[PDB]
A paper describes a structure:
pmcMicrotubules (MTs) for m by self-assembly of GTP-bound αβ-tubulin heterodimers into a cylinder consisting of laterally associated linear protofilaments (pfs). During incorporation into the MT lattice, GTP hydrolysis is triggered by the catalytic glutamate in α-tubulin (E254), which becomes juxtaposed to the GTP in β-tubulin at the longitudinal interface between dimers. GTP hydrolysis has a destabilizing effect on the MT structure, and polymerization can only continue in the presence of a GTP-tubulin cap at the growing end of the MT. Here, in order to better understand the GTP conformation of MTs, we used cryo-EM to visualize MTs assembled from recombinant wild-type (wt) and mutant human tubulin in which the catalytic glutamate in α-tubulin was mutated to alanine or asparagine (E254A or E254N, respectively), making them deficient in GTP hydrolysis.
Lattice parameters of these MTs, both undecorated and decorated with kinesin-1 motor domains, were nearly indistinguishable from previously reported GDP-MT structures assembled from mammalian brain tubulin. However, there was additional density in the recombinant MT structure corresponding to the internal His6-tag located within the partly disordered acetylation loop of α-tubulin that includes lysine 40. This purification tag has previously been shown to have no effect on polymerization dynamics, and our current study confirms that it also does not alter lattice parameters compared to the endogenous wt mammalian MTs studied previously.
Numbering used by the authors:
A (entry chain D), C (entry chain B): 1 to 429
B (entry chain C), D (entry chain A): 1 to 37, 40 to 42, 47 to 441
Write the structure that this text describes.
């Protein structure tokens, strides 16, 4: 019940999804062939929320992998944990978006979106009581951004009741992996604030810094970062994929973390994060995790929370623990950081507790903070956009697909409206 | 399944193609006869395959003087090419643009387009075109202008990449280089998606200083440029941690429709005896790429502004180090991008290491980086050409050949006006914005 | 009892019949020699409906293979599963119809039709209680079309009570395997709407598309298409060739699917259709088959049903299943597609259930839809006919055999009358 | 059991027959002496058999000059032919239609018909006739007109296929070609079921350009046409996935009784050295067949409209690919059928691959396709002949031979009128319909 459907757009989306399904299968004890070899019945008590039991007692992910080029698709397909996806789900195009959002949302995407929606509809009808959708994508690449926004708009048209999650890799503040990413980012944010229930802003820069400083890895391959983000998502869903002393679902998180329709952007965080040697030299206590999850150096969004206020906060633990301990820790952390919280929201911490650790560990924790600091991000992007739009650089590439200047004008206006609202609620009284 | 044909026009194009296809055959373990004793398909993008274990290139070799093409037919890569691809003329344009664009090439252009269309229709996911041509030679400039016009008419929106050979400021083997260069640029300015500036003078300097070869042959420069192009297409032809297509190249490196002239640069380039004594740090090789002495166009980048950069890495590369090196590059002062483009980088990472050709000159390296950089210093180079043109036009020298071979003087005036307009646009971009 | 006689006219008819008898023998466990080596008594409990028990305990098909040229006949005879037909049935001519309908119905066919009718009569007298006839032919080729129409007229004269089935390969909309096929098609349709109980329109284009897209075969040889159509026919008859929880026969299908005498043209469909690898990755559930059988991409007639209305629908399942499941699926599919059905026919789905799968599978299904979409087909053909008849192209070839222009005039008038009736009932209220 | 005799008239007919029977003997593994060391019977349709392992052809070799027939009798295929089939005249018509139709041929026509009737009565399922004859030679035109009239009188409704050699627009070995051509066409127009236009000029072009043989002999053209005819009759002589008889040919390719002049085309035709470097796609070879440069009549098909087409495939062919290729052909614009015929194709598929003759020039291919196409461009060709005729008639040149050999001038006027009427009918068909 509460079946969840997974969508993966863009190269980053597909890679993250591959690592994610690896992690999920490892949690549920699922062989690479797709059949179960696990040991605990609770694995299969809710295997149906993410998997479908194909006949002859096999399991397939309920995912939909989308692309405009066969490269990364085939790369995943050849790799292990690839031969379990149902092959009909691999929808891909040939032209390639060329890292352009206009192609990914007007010209190229408009031709595959129909087949994608058909597969979506088939999967929806297969499910018993649909819970919602989770989209894994970037915001810079043309395919991910454009096609994901298109699919989100279409789905929200076809499902104004279900829940929607997006795991977008926001561009880093310092570096810029592409050149035209401000345009795609602005348009994608426009569509997201239009029709998304919640958005999980994530930066590669913060992941780099976490892997280097905290985990003491000077050689972080993209596999590591994708593994971390996948662990985060799995921790998000484990509250319903497994029993718990205080269970939660996606709907509860949306209710608790979104006081206003537009202000649904969240910075995540995970704990504990220990090196290979520096692990046994620390006590794995709930206060330790709690204090770990509250600092700049462990936020997966490159923005110091101290610059703003924590509008809302959610926290999902795992494994056996004592509730009173968690309550006391949350109380202390809310007391000591009094200046860092919204005045008119008392007791702004949502708590969920699972019974299963993410494996290997005794107790883990996931943090989802909706703060006012993230506005800086948008501010930054907005400024950049204006610059690149004042000289109308690269404007012809997007113009040639039917888009016009007024599109960018409206998107920038909308972004500045959102920034104004965020600042307004930051200094509310 | 993402095909991209190759087109080689003129003697330079054909020799460069010889080197490039040698390099490709070495990359995929392909015999000269098309047989073969991490890899995916990979070679499918540039090699088509018949029923047997024989593969052929997706290339077209066109020339008006049968000498070099005959050498190819007699070259060790004889069994490789499909014989129909070796289109040979009878009389070369003889460093005359008019002949290469109005008289001679006009009479084989149809057959060339026919073979192009055959190879296009045989392919499915055609990414685009790769044109290999010089700039001074008559066949190169003329036939290339004609070919680009025809292709743009036929294949409207597909990738069209060019590899010109920018005539050196001082080493000019021909005498009429400015005329042909101005004409071919004025024509191609409205059709080419993205050019790739390279010059022989810079390659001479690099070969002498870095590789420590004092007396290089054209084969060596061809090997270098082949390495560059292989790095360019490795993303299509191989699995990488962050892949990239030619569409991304044209999107990222071209801010304005006219200004699409990025220059090339490659690293590391050291002798095998000097292969040791340096660990080849990723930041180290990045700095090497950004050094003005390692660029392949004789233009001091410190005289211009990098409007865009594209760094493509292959081998044992890790993203965080790339990020750190790029941040350090952004910190430095002498590299001043345009104010209105705060994001001056697109990155590409591949797992396949670069392959060193046995009998070559470079050393087996574990990592390599090619930078395609669109800067503003290139504008100055145009000025030089401008100057020369005016001289050779102030006395109407050599005009009679071009006039009598199907051209008018007003066309020359128009080409000069167009080049002046391009230089004006470069200056206009060079300024900073108010407010 | 209820013995059935099989007629195969034309090259296509003979090839389809050869594949068909192969399939039937495989179902009943019949050796190529024609003797039984099977394992289940139910095979021989109703072997007599299609086979005759020749002495010394052998079995012969109750078929009548007809042609005007020895080529394909001999090809089949030399092939395996050919040495079991009784040789006296191989009636063939020498002149060949030359892909002309006039020859196949006036001059050449009039000389063999007598011997064919004699063999038909002998077989009829051999049968105990005749059920009806099934004719396997094309509509383009001269022999198939002309001689089949002639035999149909003659038989209906000699048997105005029995039931008649025709499996005609209708010309494809896009391609045209011959040049003069509109004329033969029009005349054949004239004779069919005259004296046929039911006609199973089938196109090679749709079969191509099904084999390529669904089954993922880029190399479809005619053997594959003939195998598919033969599987369809076998599924049609299995309801009486085997026991069933809700059995049906040809007469029941004719009663249920033919509300009006002329409107007896049906588009068939089959399910499940899975690739060799993509089979285990799907659950073989009755809802899955049901939803599979309702879409454009699985109709053996090249016409989108959404362009018209499903006048009537029949569905024959096989293997063990739960009736309530089928009932619920039919209910849901009729509810969700409310705009796609005739208003004044409530509950327009006929259901039959067998006990034996077609071997290899757990459960299969066959769909026989009488829709108003197929009229487009006729419309298309009609238009083409008019064109080729306006300039009177090729008219002399048919004229030279005694046929006259008024023949074509009447046939086209009749076809347009049928089209008018179909459209009239499409928008009835 | 579906027999079809062969008739070879004139020197061209006899040489073509030499090539064709060489090809047949190779197809069925038959020695020149009739002995033999997927196949069905197959050879029964063209070979009759005696008690021993000796088979003979169902052919008739008739000529008025004993030279070539004597060469056949001395040829390596000596023991093959039944000696009575080699009817030889004494004095050739000498490129004079009157001699070939009134004086000489009139005196052996009865014996020829006698042998024809013998071979017909010995057969059972006779499909029809195959006539191999030129157009300019006196024997060809004259004897062929006489033979067609006699056969139509005797065998009313049976297949009668002809293989004329259309005189080239510029390469005319004879001088009086227009006269004989006009006369024989005016006569045969009311008897021939279906002709097959082929010309030597186009075959020269094809041999030079495709096969890369610069200096071809008549043997090579004969090999090509033999391959065409073998592809035509392979359906009768072999098992295929979609067989077809000559009756189907005449039905499909002849919309109007007078307009029954389809031209031939064949593919693939490439050298054995060029056999590789191309996979020979079915769509590829279809496009090759439809290219104007691969046709065997010097007429630009883009100047006319394909009233009908018949594509016959043999070898490893799959129907869906054929359907796709034909659909793609229908999509293209420059191929504009007549509006009133929306179905412009009949297809034939065979399993037997084409056989390459050892000592030949072509390469062993797995698939082959012959297109018999009835178009409207052929009308223009008639015009040319018309023109020439008028010239040679405006001065009454060469008339005296024809007059004094059993002909009248009003007959020439009537033949001109008939040719003009045929051209008028072609134009009338060329128009589009209203409403
Ligand atoms: N980098 C490089 N350039 C070459 C090489 N060979 C020839 N060139 C260039 O070719 C130019 C000589 O004129 P071309 O462009 O070759 O003239 P062409 O190709 O023979 O055509 P025509 O002018 O009609 O004869 C020189 O300016 C060189 O820059 C080579 O091996 N490497
Ligand atoms: N394609 C082809 N045509 C040939 C060949 N040999 C002769 N011809 C044709 O024969 C013509 C020469 O006149 P013919 O028709 O042979 O005259 P004939 O057959 O000798 O009969 P008479 O005119 O009475 O002598 C030329 O126009 C050629 O087109 C051949 O080997 N191949
Ligand atoms: N965190 C993370 N980000 C990635 C990964 N791969 C690609 N990306 C990001 O995805 C963006 C490229 O978008 P991409 O999907 O490749 O382009 P598209 O095809 O147009 O959608 C870059 O900005 C990268 O930062 C990965 O493995 N992990
Ligand atoms: N589906 C299918 N159709 C076939 C097959 N063989 C022939 N046909 C069709 O039959 C038609 C030819 O009719 P045919 O019986 O050969 O000509 P006839 O002798 O005059 O009746 C063509 O339009 C083909 O589409 C086959 O194996 N499968
Ligand atoms: Mg040259
Ligand atoms: Mg002669």
């Amino acid at each position: 019940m509460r079946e969840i459907v997974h969508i993966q757009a863009g190269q980053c989306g597909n890679q993250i999804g591959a690592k994610f399904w690896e992690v999920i299968s490892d949690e549920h004890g699922i062989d690479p062939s797709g059949n179960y070899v696990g040991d605990s019945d609770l694995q299969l008590e809710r295997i149906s929320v993410y998997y479908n039991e194909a006949s002859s007692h096999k399991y397939v992910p309920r995912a939909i992998l989308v692309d405009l080029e066969p490269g990364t698709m085939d790369s995943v397909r050849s790799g292990a944990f690839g031969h379990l996806f149902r092959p009909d789900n691999f929808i891909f195009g040939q032209s390639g978006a060329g890292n352009n959002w206009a192609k990914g949302h007007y010209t190229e995407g408009a031709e595959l979106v129909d087949s994608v929606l058909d597969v979506v509809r088939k999967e929806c009808e297969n499910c018993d009581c649909l819970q919602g959708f989770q989209l894994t994508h970037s915001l810079g690449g043309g395919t991910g951004s454009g096609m994901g926004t298109l699919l989100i708009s279409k789905v929200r048209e076809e499902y104004p009741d279900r829940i929607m999650n997006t795991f977008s890799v926001v561009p880093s503040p310092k570096v810029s992996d592409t050149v035209v990413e401000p345009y795609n980012a602005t348009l994608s944010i426009h569509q997201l604030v239009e029709n998304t229930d919640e958005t999980y802003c994530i930066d590669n820069e913060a992941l780099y810094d976490i892997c280097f400083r905290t985990l003491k890895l000077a050689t972080p391959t993209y596999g590591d970062l994708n593994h971390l983000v996948s662990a985060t998502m799995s921790g998000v869903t484990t509250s319903l994929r497994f029993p718990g002393q205080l269970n939660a679902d996606l709907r509860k998180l949306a209710v608790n973390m979104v006081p206003f329709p537009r202000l649904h952007f969240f910075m995540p965080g995970f704990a504990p994060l220990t090196a290979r040697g520096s692990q046994q030299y620390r006590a794995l206590t709930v206060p330790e995790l709690t204090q770990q999850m509250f600092d700049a150096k462990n936020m997966m969004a490159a923005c110091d929370p101290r610059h703003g206020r924590y509008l809302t906060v959610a926290t999902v633990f795992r494994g056996r623990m004592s509730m009173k301990e968690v309550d006391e820790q949350m109380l202390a952390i809310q007391s000591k950081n009094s200046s860092y919280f919204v005045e008119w929201i008392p007791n702004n911490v949502k708590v969920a507790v699972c019974d299963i650790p993410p494996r290997g560990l005794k107790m883990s924790s996931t943090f989802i903070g909706n703060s006012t600091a993230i506005q800086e991000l948008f501010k930054r992007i907005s400024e950049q956009f204006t610059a690149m739009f004042r000289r109308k650089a690269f404007l012809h590439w997007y113009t040639g697909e039917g888009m016009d200047e007024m599109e960018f004008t409206e998107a920038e206006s909308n972004m500045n409206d959102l920034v104004s609202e965020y600042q307004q609620y930051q200094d509310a009284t | 399944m993402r095909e991209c044909i190759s087109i080689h026009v003129g003697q330079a194009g054909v020799q460069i193609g010889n080197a490039c296809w040698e390099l490709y055959c070495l990359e995929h373990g392909i015999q000269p006869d098309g047989q073969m004793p991490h890899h995916h398909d990979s070679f499918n993008t540039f090699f088509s395959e018949t029923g047997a274990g024989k593969h052929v290139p997706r290339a077209v070799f066109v020339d008006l003087e049968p000498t070099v093409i005959d050498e190819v037919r007699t070259g060790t890569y004889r069994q490789l090419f499909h014989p129909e691809q070796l289109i040979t003329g009878k009389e070369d344009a003889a460093n005359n643009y008019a002949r290469g664009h109005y008289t001679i090439g006009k009479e084989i252009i149809d057959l060339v387009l026919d073979r192009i269309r055959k190879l296009a229709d045989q392919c499915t996911g055609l990414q685009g075109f790769l044109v290999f041509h010089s700039f001074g030679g008559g066949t190169g400039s003329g036939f290339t202008s004609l070919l680009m016009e025809r292709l743009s008419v036929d294949y409207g929106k597909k990738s069209k990449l060019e590899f010109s050979i920018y005539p050196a400021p001082q080493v000019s083997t021909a005498v009429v280089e400015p005329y042909n260069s101005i004409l071919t640029t004025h024509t191609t300015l409205e059709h080419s998606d993205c050019a790739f500036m390279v010059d022989n003078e810079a390659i001479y300097d690099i070969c002498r200083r870095n590789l420590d070869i004092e007396r290089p042959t054209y084969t060596n420069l061809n090997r270098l440029i082949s390495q560059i192009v292989s790095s360019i297409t490795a993303s299509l032809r191989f699995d990488g941690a962050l892949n990239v297509d030619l569409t991304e190249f044209q999107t990222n490196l071209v801010p304005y429709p006219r200004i699409h002239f990025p220059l090339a640069t490659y690293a590391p380039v050291i002798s095998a005896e000097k292969a040791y004594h340096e660990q080849l740090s990723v930041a180290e090789i990045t700095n090497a790429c950004f050094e003005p002495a390692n660029q392949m166009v004789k233009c001091d980048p410190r005289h211009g502004k990098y409007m865009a950069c594209c760094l493509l890495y292959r081998g044992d590369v890790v993203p965080k180090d790339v990020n750190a090196a790029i941040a350090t590059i952004k910190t430095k002062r002498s590299i001043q991008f345009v104010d209105w483009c705060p994001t001056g980088f697109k990155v590409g990472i591949n797992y396949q290491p670069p392959t060193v050709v046995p009998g070559g000159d470079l050393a087996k390296v574990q990592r390599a980086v090619c930078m395609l950089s669109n800067t503003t210093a290139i504008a100055e180079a145009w000025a030089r050409l401008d100057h020369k043109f005016d001289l050779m036009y102030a006395k109407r020298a050599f005009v009679h050949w071009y006039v009598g071979e199907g051209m008018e003087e007003g066309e020359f005036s128009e080409a000069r006006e167009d080049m002046a307009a391009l230089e004006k646009d470069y200056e206009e971009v060079g300024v900073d914005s108010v407010e």
